[PDB]
Short mmCIF file of C-alpha atoms and ligand atoms in Angstrom, two decimals:
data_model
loop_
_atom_site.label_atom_id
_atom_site.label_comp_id
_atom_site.label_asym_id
_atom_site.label_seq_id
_atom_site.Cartn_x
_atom_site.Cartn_y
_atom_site.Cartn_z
CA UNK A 1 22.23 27.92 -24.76
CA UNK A 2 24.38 27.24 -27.59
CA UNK A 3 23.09 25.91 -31.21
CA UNK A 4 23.96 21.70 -31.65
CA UNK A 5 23.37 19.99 -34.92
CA UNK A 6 23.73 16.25 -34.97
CA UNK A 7 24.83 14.68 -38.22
CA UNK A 8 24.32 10.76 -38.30
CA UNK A 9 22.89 8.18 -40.45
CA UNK A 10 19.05 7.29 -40.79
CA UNK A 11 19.30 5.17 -37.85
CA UNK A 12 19.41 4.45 -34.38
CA UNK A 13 23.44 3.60 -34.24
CA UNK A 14 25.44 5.09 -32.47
CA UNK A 15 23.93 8.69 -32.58
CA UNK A 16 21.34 7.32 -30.08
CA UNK A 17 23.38 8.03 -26.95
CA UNK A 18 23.29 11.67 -27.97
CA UNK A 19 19.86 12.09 -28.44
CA UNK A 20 18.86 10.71 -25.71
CA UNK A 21 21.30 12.54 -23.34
CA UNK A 22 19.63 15.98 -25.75
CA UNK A 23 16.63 14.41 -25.11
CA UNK A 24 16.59 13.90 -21.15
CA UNK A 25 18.66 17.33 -20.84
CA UNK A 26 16.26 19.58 -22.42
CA UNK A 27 18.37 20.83 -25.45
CA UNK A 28 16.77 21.71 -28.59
CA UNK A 29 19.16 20.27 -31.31
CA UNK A 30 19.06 19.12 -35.38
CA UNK A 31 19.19 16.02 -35.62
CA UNK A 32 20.62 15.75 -39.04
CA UNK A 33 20.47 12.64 -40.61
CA UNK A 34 21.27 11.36 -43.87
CA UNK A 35 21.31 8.82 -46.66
CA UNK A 36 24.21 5.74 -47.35
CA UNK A 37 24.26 7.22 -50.47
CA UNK A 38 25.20 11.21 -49.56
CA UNK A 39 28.07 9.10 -46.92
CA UNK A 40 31.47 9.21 -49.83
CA UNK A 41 30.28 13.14 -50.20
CA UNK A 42 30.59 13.37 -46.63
CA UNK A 43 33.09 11.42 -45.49
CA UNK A 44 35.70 13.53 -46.74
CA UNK A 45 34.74 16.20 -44.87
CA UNK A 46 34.52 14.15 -41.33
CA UNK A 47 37.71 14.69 -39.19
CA UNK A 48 38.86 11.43 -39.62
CA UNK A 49 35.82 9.87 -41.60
CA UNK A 50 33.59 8.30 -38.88
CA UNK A 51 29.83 9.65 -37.99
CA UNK A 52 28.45 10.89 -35.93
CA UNK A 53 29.79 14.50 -35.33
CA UNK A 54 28.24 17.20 -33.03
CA UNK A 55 28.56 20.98 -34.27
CA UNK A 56 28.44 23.08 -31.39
CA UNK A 57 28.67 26.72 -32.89
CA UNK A 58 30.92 25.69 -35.57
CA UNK A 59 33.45 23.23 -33.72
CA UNK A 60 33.04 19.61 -34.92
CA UNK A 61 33.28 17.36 -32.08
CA UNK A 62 33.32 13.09 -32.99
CA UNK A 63 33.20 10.16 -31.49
CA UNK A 64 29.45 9.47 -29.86
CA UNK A 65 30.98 8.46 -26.43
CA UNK A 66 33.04 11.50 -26.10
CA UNK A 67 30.26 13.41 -27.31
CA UNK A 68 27.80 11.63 -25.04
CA UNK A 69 30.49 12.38 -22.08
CA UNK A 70 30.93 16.37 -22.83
CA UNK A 71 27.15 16.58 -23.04
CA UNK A 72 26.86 15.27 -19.52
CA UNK A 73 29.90 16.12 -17.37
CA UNK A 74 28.19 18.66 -14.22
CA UNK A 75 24.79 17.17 -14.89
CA UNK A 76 22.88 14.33 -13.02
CA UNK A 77 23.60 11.78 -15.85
CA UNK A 78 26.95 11.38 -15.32
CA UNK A 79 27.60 10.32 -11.81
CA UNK A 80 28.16 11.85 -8.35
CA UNK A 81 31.79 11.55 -8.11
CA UNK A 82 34.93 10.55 -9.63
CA UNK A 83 34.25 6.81 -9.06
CA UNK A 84 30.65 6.60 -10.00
CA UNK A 85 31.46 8.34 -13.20
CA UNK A 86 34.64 5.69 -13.98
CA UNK A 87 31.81 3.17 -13.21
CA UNK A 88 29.63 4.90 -15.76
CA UNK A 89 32.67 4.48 -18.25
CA UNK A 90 33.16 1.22 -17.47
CA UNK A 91 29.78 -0.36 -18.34
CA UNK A 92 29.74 2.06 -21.29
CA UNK A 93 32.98 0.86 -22.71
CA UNK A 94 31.98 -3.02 -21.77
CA UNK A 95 28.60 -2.68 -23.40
CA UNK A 96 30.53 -0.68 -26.35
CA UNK A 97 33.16 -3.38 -26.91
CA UNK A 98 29.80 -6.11 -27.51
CA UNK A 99 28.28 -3.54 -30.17
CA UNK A 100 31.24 -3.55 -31.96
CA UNK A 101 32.51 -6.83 -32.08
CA UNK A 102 29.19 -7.30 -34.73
CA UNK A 103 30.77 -7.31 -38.39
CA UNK A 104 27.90 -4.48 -39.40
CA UNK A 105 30.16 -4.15 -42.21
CA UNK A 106 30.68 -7.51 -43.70
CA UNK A 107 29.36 -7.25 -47.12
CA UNK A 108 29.23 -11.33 -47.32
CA UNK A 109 25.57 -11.70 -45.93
CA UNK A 110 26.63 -15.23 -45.19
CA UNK A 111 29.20 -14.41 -43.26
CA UNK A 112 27.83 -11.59 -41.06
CA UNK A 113 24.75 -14.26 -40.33
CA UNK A 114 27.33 -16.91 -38.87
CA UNK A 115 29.28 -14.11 -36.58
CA UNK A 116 25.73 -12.43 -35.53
CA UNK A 117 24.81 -16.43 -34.37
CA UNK A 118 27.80 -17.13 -32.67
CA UNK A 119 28.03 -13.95 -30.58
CA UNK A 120 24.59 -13.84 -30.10
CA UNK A 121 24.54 -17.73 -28.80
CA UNK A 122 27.77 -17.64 -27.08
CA UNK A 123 28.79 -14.52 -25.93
CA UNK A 124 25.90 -12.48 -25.42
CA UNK A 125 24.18 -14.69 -23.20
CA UNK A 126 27.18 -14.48 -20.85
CA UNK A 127 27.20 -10.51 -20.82
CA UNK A 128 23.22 -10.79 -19.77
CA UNK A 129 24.62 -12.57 -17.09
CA UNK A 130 27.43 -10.14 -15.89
CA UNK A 131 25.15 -6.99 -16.52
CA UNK A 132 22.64 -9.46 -13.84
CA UNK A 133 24.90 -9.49 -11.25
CA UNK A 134 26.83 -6.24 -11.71
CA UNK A 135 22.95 -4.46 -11.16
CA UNK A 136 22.44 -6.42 -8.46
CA UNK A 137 19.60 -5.61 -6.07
CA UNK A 138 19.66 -1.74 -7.46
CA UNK A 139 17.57 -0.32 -9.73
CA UNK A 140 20.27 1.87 -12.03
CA UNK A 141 23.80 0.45 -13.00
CA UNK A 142 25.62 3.10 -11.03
CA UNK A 143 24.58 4.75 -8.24
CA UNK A 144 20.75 5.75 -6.77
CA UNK A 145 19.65 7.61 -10.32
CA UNK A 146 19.96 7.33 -13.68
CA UNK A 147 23.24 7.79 -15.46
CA UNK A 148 23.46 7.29 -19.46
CA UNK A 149 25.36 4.34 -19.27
CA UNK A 150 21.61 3.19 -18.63
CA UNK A 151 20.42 5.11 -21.53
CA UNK A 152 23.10 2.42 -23.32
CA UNK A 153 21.92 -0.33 -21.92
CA UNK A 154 18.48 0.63 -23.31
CA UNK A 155 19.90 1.94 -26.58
CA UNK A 156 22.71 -1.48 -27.04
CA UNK A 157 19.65 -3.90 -26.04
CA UNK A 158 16.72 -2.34 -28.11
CA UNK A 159 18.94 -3.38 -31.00
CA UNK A 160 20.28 -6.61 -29.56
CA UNK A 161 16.85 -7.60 -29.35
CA UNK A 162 15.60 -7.12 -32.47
CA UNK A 163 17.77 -10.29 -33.38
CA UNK A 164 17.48 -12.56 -30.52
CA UNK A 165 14.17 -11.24 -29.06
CA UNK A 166 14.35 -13.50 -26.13
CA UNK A 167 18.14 -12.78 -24.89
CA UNK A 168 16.60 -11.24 -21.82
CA UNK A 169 13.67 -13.42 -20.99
CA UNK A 170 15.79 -15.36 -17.75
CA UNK A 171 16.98 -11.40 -16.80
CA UNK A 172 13.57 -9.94 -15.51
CA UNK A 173 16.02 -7.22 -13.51
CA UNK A 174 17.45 -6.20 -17.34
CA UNK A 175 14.30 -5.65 -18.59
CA UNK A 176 12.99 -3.34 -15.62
CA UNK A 177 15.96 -1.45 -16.19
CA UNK A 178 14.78 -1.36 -19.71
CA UNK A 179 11.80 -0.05 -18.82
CA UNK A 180 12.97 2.50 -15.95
CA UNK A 181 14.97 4.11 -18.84
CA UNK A 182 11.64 4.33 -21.33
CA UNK A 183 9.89 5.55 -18.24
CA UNK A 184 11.67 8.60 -18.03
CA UNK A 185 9.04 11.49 -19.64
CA UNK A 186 11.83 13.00 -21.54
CA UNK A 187 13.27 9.88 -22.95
CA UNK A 188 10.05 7.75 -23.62
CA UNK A 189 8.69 11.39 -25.33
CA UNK A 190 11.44 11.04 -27.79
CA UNK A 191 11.26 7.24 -28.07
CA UNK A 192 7.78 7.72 -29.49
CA UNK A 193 8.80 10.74 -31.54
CA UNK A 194 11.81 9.26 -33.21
CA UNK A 195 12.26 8.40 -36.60
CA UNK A 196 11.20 4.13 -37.22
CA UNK A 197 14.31 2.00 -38.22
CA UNK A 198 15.60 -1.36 -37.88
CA UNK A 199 19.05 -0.18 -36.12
CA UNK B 1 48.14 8.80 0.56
CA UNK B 2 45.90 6.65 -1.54
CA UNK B 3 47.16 2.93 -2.58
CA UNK B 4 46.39 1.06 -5.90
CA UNK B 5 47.16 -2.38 -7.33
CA UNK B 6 46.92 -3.32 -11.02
CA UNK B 7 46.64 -6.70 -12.90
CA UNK B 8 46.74 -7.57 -16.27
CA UNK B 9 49.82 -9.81 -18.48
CA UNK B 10 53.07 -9.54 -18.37
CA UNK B 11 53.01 -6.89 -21.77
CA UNK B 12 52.36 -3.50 -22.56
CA UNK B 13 48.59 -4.33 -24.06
CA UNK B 14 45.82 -1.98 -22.72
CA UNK B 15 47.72 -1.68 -19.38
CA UNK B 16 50.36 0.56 -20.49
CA UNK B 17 48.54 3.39 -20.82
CA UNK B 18 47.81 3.51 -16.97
CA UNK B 19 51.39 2.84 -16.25
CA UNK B 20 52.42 6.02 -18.16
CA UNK B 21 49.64 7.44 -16.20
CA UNK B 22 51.25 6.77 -12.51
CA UNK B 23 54.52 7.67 -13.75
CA UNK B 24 53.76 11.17 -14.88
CA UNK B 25 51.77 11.79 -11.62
CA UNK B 26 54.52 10.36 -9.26
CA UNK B 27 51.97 7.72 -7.95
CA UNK B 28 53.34 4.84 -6.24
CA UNK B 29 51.22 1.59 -7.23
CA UNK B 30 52.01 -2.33 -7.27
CA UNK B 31 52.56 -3.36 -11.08
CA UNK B 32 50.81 -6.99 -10.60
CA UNK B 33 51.77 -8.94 -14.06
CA UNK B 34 49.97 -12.13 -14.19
CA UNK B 35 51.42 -15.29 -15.94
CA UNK B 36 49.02 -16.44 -18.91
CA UNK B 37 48.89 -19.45 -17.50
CA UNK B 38 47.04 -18.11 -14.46
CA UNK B 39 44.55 -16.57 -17.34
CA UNK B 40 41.56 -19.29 -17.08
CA UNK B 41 41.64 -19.30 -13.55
CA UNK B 42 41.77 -15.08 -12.77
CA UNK B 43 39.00 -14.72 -15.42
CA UNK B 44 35.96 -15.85 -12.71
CA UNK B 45 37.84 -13.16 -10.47
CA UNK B 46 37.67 -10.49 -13.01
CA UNK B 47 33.60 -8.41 -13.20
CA UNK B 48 33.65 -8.88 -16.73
CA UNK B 49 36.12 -11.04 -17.68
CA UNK B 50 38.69 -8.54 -19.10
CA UNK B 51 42.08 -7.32 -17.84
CA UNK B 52 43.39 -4.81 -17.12
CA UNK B 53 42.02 -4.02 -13.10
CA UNK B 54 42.81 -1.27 -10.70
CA UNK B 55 42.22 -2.40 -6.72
CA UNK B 56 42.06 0.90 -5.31
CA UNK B 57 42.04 0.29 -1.52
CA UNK B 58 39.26 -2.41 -1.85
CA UNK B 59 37.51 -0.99 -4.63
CA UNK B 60 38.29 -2.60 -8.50
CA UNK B 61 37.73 -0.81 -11.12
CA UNK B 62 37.95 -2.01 -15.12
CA UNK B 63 38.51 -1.15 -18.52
CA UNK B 64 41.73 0.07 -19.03
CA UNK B 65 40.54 3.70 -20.83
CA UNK B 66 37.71 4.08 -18.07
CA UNK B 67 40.50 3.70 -15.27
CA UNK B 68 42.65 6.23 -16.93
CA UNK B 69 40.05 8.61 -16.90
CA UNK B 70 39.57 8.41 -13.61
CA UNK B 71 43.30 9.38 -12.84
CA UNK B 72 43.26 11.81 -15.26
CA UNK B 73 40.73 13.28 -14.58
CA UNK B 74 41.13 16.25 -12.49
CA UNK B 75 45.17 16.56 -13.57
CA UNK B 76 46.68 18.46 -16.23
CA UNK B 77 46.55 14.87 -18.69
CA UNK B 78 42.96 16.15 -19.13
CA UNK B 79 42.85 18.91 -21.18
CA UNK B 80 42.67 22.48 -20.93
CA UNK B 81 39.10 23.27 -21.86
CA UNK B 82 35.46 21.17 -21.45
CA UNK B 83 35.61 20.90 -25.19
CA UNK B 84 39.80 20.02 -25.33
CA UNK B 85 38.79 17.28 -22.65
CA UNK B 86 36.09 16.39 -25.73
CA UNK B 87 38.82 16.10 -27.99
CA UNK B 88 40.92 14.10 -25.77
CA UNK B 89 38.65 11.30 -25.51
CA UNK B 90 37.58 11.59 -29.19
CA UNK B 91 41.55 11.39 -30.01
CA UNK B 92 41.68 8.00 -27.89
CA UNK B 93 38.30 6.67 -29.07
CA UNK B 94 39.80 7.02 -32.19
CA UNK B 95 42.90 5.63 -31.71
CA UNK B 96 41.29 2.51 -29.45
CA UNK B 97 38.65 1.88 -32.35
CA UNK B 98 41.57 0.89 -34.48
CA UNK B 99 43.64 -1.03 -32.38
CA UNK B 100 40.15 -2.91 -31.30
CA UNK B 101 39.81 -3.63 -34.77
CA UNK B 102 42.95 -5.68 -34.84
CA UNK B 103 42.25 -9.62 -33.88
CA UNK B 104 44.66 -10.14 -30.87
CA UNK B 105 42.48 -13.27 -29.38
CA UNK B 106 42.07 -14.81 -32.99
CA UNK B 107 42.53 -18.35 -32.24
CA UNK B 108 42.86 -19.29 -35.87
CA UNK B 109 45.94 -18.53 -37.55
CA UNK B 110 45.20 -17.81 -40.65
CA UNK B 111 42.78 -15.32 -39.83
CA UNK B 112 45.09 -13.37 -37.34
CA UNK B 113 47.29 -12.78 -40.63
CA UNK B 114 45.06 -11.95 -42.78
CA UNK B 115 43.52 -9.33 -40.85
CA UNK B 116 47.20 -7.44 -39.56
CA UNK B 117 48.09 -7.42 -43.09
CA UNK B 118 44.95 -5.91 -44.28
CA UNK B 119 44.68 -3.41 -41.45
CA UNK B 120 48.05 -2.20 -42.14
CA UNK B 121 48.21 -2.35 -45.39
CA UNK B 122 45.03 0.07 -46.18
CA UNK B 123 43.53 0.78 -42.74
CA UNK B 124 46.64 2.36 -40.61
CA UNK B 125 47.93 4.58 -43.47
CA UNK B 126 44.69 6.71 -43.74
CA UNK B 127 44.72 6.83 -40.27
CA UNK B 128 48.20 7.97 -39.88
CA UNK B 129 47.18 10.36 -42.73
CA UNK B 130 44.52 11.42 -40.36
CA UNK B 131 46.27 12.12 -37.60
CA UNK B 132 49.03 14.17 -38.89
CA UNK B 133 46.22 16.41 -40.69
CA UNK B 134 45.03 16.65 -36.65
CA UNK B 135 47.81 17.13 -35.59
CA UNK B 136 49.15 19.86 -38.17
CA UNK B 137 51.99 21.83 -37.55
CA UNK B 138 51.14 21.87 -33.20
CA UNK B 139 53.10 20.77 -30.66
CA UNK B 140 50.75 18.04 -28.70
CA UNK B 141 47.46 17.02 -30.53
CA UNK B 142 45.49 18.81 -28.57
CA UNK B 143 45.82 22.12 -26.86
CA UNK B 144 49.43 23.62 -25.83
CA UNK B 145 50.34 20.85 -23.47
CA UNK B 146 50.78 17.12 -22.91
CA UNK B 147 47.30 15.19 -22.76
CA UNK B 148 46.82 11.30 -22.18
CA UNK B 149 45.88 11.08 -25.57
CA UNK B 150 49.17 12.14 -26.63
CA UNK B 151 50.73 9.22 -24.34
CA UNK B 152 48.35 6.91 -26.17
CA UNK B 153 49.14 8.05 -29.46
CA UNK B 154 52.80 7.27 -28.44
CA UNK B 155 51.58 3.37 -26.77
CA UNK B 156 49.50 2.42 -29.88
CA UNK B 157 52.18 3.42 -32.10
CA UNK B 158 54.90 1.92 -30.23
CA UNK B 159 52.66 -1.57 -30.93
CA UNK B 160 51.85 -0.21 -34.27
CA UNK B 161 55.66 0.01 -35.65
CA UNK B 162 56.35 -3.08 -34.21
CA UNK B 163 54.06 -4.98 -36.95
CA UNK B 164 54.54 -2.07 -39.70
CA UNK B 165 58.12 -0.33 -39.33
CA UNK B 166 57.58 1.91 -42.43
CA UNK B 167 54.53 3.28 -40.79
CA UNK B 168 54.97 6.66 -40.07
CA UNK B 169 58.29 6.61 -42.63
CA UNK B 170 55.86 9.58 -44.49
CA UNK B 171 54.88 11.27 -40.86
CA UNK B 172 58.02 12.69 -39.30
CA UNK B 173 55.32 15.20 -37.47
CA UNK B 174 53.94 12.08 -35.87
CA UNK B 175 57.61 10.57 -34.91
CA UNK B 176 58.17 13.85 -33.12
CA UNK B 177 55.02 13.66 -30.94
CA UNK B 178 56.43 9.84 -29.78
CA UNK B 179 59.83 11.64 -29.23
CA UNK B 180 58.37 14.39 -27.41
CA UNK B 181 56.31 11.81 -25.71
CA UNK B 182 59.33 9.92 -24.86
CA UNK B 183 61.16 12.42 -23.54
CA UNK B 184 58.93 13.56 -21.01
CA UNK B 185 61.22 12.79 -17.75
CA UNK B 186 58.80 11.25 -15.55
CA UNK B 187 57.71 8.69 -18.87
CA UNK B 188 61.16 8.68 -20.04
CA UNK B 189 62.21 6.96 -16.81
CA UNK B 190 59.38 4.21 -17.32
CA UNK B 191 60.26 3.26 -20.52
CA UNK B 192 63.42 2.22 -19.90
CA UNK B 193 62.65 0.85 -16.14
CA UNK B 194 59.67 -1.40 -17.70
CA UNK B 195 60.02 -4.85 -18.60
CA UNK B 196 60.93 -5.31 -22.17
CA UNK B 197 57.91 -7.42 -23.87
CA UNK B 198 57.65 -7.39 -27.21
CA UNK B 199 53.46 -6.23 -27.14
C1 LIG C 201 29.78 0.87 -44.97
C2 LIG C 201 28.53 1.64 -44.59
C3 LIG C 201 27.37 1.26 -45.50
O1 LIG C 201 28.79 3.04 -44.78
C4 LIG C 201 28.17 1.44 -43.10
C5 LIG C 201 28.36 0.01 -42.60
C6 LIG C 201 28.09 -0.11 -41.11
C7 LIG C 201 26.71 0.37 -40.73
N1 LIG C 201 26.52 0.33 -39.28
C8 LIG C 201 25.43 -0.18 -38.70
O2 LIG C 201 24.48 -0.61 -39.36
C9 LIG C 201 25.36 -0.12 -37.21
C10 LIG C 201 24.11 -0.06 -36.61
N2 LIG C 201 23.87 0.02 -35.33
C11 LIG C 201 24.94 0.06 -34.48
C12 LIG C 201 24.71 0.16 -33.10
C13 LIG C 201 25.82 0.19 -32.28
N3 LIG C 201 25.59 0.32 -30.93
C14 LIG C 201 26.49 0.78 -29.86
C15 LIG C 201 25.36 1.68 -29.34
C16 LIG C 201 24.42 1.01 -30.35
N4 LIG C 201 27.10 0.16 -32.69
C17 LIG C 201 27.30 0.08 -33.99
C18 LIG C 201 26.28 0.03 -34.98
C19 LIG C 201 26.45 -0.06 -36.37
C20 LIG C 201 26.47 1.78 -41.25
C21 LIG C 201 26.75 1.89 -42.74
C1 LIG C 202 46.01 -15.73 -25.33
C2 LIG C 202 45.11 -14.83 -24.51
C3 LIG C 202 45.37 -15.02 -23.02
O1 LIG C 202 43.74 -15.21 -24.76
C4 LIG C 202 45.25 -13.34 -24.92
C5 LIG C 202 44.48 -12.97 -26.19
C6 LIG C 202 44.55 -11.47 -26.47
C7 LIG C 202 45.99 -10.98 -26.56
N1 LIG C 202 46.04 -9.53 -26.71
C8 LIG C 202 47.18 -8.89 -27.00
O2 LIG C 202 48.24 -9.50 -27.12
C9 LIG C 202 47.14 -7.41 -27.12
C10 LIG C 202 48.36 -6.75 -27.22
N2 LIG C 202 48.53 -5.45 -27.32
C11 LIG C 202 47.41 -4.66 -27.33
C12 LIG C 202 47.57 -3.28 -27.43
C13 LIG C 202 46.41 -2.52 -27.44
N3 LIG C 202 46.57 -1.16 -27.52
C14 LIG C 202 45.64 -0.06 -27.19
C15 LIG C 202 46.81 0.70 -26.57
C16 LIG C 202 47.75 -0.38 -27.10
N4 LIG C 202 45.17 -2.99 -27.34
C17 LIG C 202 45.03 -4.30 -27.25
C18 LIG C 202 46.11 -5.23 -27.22
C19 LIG C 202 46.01 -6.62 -27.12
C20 LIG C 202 46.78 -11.40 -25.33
C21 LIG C 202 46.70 -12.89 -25.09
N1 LIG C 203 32.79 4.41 -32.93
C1 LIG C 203 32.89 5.83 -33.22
C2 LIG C 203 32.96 6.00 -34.72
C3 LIG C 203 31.63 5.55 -35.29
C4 LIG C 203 31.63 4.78 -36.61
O1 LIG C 203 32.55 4.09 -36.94
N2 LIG C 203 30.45 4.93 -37.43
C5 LIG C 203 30.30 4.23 -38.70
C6 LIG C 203 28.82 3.88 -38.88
S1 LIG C 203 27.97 3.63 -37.29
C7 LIG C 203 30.84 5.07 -39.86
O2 LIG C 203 30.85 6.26 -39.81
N3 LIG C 203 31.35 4.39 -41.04
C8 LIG C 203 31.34 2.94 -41.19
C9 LIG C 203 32.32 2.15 -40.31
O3 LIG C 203 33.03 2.75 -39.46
O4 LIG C 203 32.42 0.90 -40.46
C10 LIG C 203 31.67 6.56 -32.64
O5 LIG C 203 31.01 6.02 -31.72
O6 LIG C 203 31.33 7.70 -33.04
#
């Protein structure tokens, strides 16, 4: 076993992916997490500015989806073969691009509302529907078992939902998979354990 | 021998990066360019709604950086190490983030200038700043050999220069990774064999 520290922001984020694949996998890690306020004395130091970062025995390693992808590759998480794990990448990404179209950034509070309405109104409703019929009539995303692009669904709806709290009340099959996901002993262990914040 | 078909526009766009994939390889594959005319209609066809796809002999896969991990994946593209393989993704996260960032859809057109300015004007120079740090005084930016990141570094900066010619006029480390990029037989032949869009 090697020695991981995790270095995000007091939140969720986009650090949650990694816990939860630490989480599920058995791996004792720090999950080091700091304030906005210690992020300019940091940020200098990041690779190329962004958090999170993984330190496996001194080697920085960024970018949560890489990360998230290393962690798993030869375990169950990730897929049985070569197509099931592009799968796994695919819904990732596809969920990934949604999170980030959000202006988290906009300092305007007006203007983040309007974009949070619009794609929450508009576009997200039409995802629900494509995640609906991509699942089907299975109960994971890809495959027979759990991967951690259902871990992201989880992680990308527990915060969509804290905005539009019904976006998945005509997708009863979403929220199972919600649930499947929080089922898992590991995962719903550290769901309870983990720190309380909005995002 | 395994056959593949791929659709997206008639440009380089997220595409490219596969078809720099199937020419180093020496893969034989249809390039389908669809006419953006043909957009409204092929959008219903598409899982998610998003080009580029791969048929592979009645499968389709999406999202362009998914489906060139899958072809990558157990080649020499990939890296040399689990944790180089890391880095490769992290490298084309990266780079993806900030092309993602630009608003190629914006239907207003006010806002689609205001943003390319910005982005290059503040945005694309620390990144470039970045990347040559990364890169340092190496050969490819990661390990001792070619990766696919190093063939996206070349695509995004190909668009890049397009929009900002005195990019990387303070990076001539980066301008000799395209140039060793570009040299590569099997992707020098593509280049000039592809059609000549302007994105
Ligand atoms: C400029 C500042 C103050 O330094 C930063 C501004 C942006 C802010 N970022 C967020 O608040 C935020 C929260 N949650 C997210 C969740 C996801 N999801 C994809 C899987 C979950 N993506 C992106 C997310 C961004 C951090 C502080
Ligand atoms: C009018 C339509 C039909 O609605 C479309 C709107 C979107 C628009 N998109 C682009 O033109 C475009 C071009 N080049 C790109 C390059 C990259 N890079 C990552 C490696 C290079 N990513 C994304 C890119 C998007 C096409 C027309
Ligand atoms: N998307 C990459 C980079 C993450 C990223 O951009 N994180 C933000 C906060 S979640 C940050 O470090 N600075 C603020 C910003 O990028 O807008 C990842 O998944 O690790």
């Amino acid at each position: 076993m090697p020695n991981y520290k995790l270095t995000y922001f007091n939140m969720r984020g986009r650090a949650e992916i990694i816990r939860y694949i630490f989480a599920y996998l058995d791996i004792q890690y720090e999950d080091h997490r700091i304030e906005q306020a210690d992020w300019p004395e940091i940020k200098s130091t990041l690779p190329f500015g962004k958090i999170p970062i993984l330190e496996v025995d001194g080697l920085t390693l960024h970018q949560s989806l890489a990360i998230a992808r290393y962690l798993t590759k030869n375990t169950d998480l990730a897929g049985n073969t070569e197509m099931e794990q592009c799968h796994v990448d695919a819904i990732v990404d596809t969920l990934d691009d949604f999170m980030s179209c959000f202006p988290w950034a906009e300092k305007k509070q007006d203007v983040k509302e309007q974009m949070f309405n619009e794609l929450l109104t508009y576009n997200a409703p039409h995802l629900m529907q494509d995640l609906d019929t991509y699942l089907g009539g299975r109960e994971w995303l890809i495959g027979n078992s759990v991967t951690w692009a259902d871990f992201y669904w989880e992680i990308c709806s527990t915060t969509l939902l804290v905005f539009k709290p019904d976006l998945l009340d005509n997708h009863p099959r979403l929220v199972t998979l919600r649930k499947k996901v929080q089922a898992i002993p590991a995962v719903a262990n550290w769901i309870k354990r983990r720190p309380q914040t909005k995002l």
